[PDB]
Amino acid sequence: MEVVAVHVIPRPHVNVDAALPLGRTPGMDADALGMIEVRGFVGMVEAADAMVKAAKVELIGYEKTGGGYVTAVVRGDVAAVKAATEAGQRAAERVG
Amino acid sequence: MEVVAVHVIPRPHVNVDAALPLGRTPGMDKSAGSADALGMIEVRGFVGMVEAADAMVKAAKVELIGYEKTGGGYVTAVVRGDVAAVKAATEAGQRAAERVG
Amino acid sequence: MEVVAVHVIPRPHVNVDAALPLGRTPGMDADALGMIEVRGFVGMVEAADAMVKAAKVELIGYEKTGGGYVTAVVRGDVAAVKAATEAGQRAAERVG
Amino acid sequence: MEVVAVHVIPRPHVNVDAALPLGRTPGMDKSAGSADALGMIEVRGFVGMVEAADAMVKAAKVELIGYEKTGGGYVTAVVRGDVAAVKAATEAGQRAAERVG
Amino acid sequence: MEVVAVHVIPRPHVNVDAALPLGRTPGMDADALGMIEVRGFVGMVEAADAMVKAAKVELIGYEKTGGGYVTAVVRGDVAAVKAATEAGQRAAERVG
Amino acid sequence: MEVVAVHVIPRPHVNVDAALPLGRTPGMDKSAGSADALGMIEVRGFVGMVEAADAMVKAAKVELIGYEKTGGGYVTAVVRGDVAAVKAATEAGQRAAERVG
């Protein structure tokens, strides 16, 4: 199925991790950020599952922004996040 | 009616079950100290979702654990069970949702 | 007005009544289920009113799924639910 | 502006008033021990809804009991009163909403 | 950007101020009502800012109705509300 | 990706900051007893918003105070700082959101 966006932020600003719900509140004992947004819970769950299986990342949760839009969020080392999001995108596109 | 998506994850990663509301929080068992397969049917329609969910639990030894609401009219029915049961369940649920008018 | 779906489940699975908000939690002292989904609160209310007037069913409530979508839910004996949902559909289609 | 729906139910069933948020829960009266008619104007627009609601209560002896939000920008204004008052109120509310720009 | 609606109610009914969240609950010690609805938070904020700068009105808040729709609400004397909403509409249309 | 809107208000009225969740409630300062400029990037996409927000705070001396969710998939990233910083920040955020795929 169609994906809205697949993106990697290798070194997020500390202000982004503090202000936004991305699983790495500064001070809670700088991971790369990977995100996959899908207009589809089923596609987002498959992408999330493929992400955590493809590389050493953690699924921290998901963002619901209404209208059917959900974003799976993973953190980890930059290379791992890149590998995960690539795998997650391919998995979501296979859903159908 | 039209189904948004139908999908089975045979062996969901433990992180998925820990982080998402899919009815099988790791550690929530009497023998916790191999996860169930995961079936999902997504419809832009509560009525089609309910019908899909009813068909799924009548078709196979799966547990309907709840549904997910993402807004915009979109809802997902979530079932858990053994791999083969979940595949049979979601096939029947897809067919039942196709019949809703 | 246009209706999204009109449907009857004559004998719902006990798991559906336990997991979903359909007014018959198992154990709270197997009714048929009738549902009418409308992209319109006004049309849903008219359908609900016509349903409970047309046959012996109870309106248990309604589901809001966003984007303007609402579903009226009624329970009762199978024949009554069929009669109600038929009446509710005709009533909602007359709204305009 | 465009109105989604305008509608009067002269004598809503008591089950409707008991189960839906339409401002007249059965039994909530000083002489409870015949229900008001029900007018509703639905707009994909809060501004048109407010204007409709204001026109309705200025046009007739009806009570605006609240509004219903179903997402997607959709809102419904709900008035209660005698049948004839509600019919006059909703006609004026429809006309007023048609004038909003 | 496109505005959904710009409207002024010179003398709202007391029932409208009591039943709806428009910043003038009757009894909390009859202001005109001005509203600007935008399918866009950014456009609504610019309109709101232009409104309170253009005339003697108060921004009382905003209504979120889903689907991206937000409505800024201002109160004041009729002439002030008219001047404000005219200014707010022009400001929102300039956003782009 | 497509950006819904990008906009700077150099000197937001105090009533705006008092009534809307824009991160600068009047009086919430150690020397309260001139307001920061306001930058906003709106996307129908959480991912584009996050990228926009990250670019904004890396590009200039602005504070990301939060984001606004209006449903339908729409979200707005909100930054506060001096006028010139906010203009530079939002320009970079717009460019970064344009690169998201």
UniProtKB/Swiss-Prot annotation, chains A, C, E:
Q: Which Pfam families match?
A: BMC
Q: Which UniProt keywords apply?
A: Bacterial microcompartment
Q: Does the keyword DNA repair apply?
A: no
Limits of the BMC domain: 2-96
Q: How does it assemble?
A: Homohexamer with a small central pore. When purified protein is examined by atomic force microscopy it dynamically makes uniform patches about 35 Angstroms thick with hexamers in the same orientation. In the BMC the concave side faces outward, with the N- and C-terminii exposed to the cytoplasm.
Q: Which family does it belong to?
A: Belongs to the bacterial microcompartments protein family.
What is the annotated role of this protein in its UniProt record? The only hexameric shell protein in this bacterium, it forms the majority of the bacterial microcompartment (BMC) shell. Expression of 5 proteins in E.coli (BMC-H (Hoch_5815), BMC-P (Hoch_5814), and 3 BMC-T (Hoch_5812, Hoch_5816, Hoch_3341)) forms a 40 nm artificial BMC with a molecular mass of 6.5 MDa. There are 60 BMC-H hexamers per BMC. The shell facets are 20-30 Angstroms thick (a single hexamer layer), with 1 of BMC-T trimers protruding to the exterior.
Mind telling me what this protein is named? Answer: Bacterial microcompartment protein homohexamer
UniProtKB/Swiss-Prot annotation, chains B, D, F:
Null mutant phenotype reads: Absolutely required for BMC formation; when deleted from an artificial operon (Hoch_5815, Hoch_5812, Hoch_3341, Hoch_5816, Hoch_4425, Hoch_4426, Hoch_5814) being expressed in E.coli, no BMC shells are made.
Q: Which SMART domains would you find in this protein's record?
A: BMC
State how it assembles: Homohexamer with a small central pore. When purified protein is examined by atomic force microscopy it dynamically makes uniform patches about 35 Angstroms thick with hexamers in the same orientation. In the BMC the concave side faces outward, with the N- and C-terminii exposed to the cytoplasm.
What is known about what this protein does? The only hexameric shell protein in this bacterium, it forms the majority of the bacterial microcompartment (BMC) shell. Expression of 5 proteins in E.coli (BMC-H (Hoch_5815), BMC-P (Hoch_5814), and 3 BMC-T (Hoch_5812, Hoch_5816, Hoch_3341)) forms a 40 nm artificial BMC with a molecular mass of 6.5 MDa. There are 60 BMC-H hexamers per BMC. The shell facets are 20-30 Angstroms thick (a single hexamer layer), with 1 of BMC-T trimers protruding to the exterior.
Domain BMC as annotated: residue spans: 2-101
Keyword Nucleotide-binding in record: no
Which family is this sequence assigned to? Answer: Belongs to the bacterial microcompartments protein family.
Which keywords appear in this protein's UniProt record, sorted alphabetically? Bacterial microcompartment
Q: How is it used?
A: Artificial BMCs can be made in E.coli by expressing (Hoch_5815, Hoch_5812, Hoch_3341, Hoch_5816, Hoch_4425, Hoch_4426, Hoch_5814) or (BMC-H (Hoch_5815), BMC-P (Hoch_5814), and 3 BMC-T (Hoch_5812, Hoch_5816, Hoch_3341)). Cargo proteins can be targeted to this BMC. Artificial BMCs can be made by duplicating this gene with a 16 residue linker between the copies (making an artificial BMC-T). The shell assembles into balls with holes where the pentameric subunit would be, and can be used as a model to study assembly and permeability.
Q: Is Repeat set as a keyword in this record? A: no
Location in the cell reads: Bacterial microcompartment
Effect in UniProt of substituting K61A: Forms larger hexamer patches, increases hexamer stacking
What is the name of the protein in this document? Bacterial microcompartment protein homohexamer
What superkingdom does the record give? Answer: Bacteria
Q: Name one GO cellular component term.
A: bacterial microcompartment
Q: Which InterPro entries match?
A: Bact_microcomp_CS (IPR020808), BMC_dom (IPR000249), BMC_shell (IPR050575), CcmK-like_sf (IPR037233), CcmK/CsoS1_BMC (IPR044872)
